[PDB]
């Protein structure tokens, strides 16, 4: 997310036993980094 010129990243890594889909249970993501970079963002893309 972007707030007040900061770009924030949160994450989680978990083992799962399901190939098709997201697990129905609950788990909470924790902050990785909080970057002071100030850019406008309206689009994104993943790298493969």
């Amino acid at each position: 997310k972007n707030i007040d010129g900061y770009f924030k990243i949160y994450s989680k890594h978990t083992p799962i036993n399901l190939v098709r889909d997201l697990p129905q249970g609950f788990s909470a993501l924790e902050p990785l980094v909080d970057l002071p970079i100030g850019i406008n963002i309206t689009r994104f893309q993943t790298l493969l």
Binding site: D4, G5, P36, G38, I39, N40
Partner: peptide
């Protein structure tokens, strides 16, 4: 601070045009 001793010449290299935006 004023900087007329450092940054004047004129010194037209100095340019001008959301919070903390760097719109180049």
């Amino acid at each position: 601070w004023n900087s007329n001793n450092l940054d004047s010449k004129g010194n037209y290299n100095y340019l001008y045009r959301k919070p903390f935006e760097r719109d180049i």
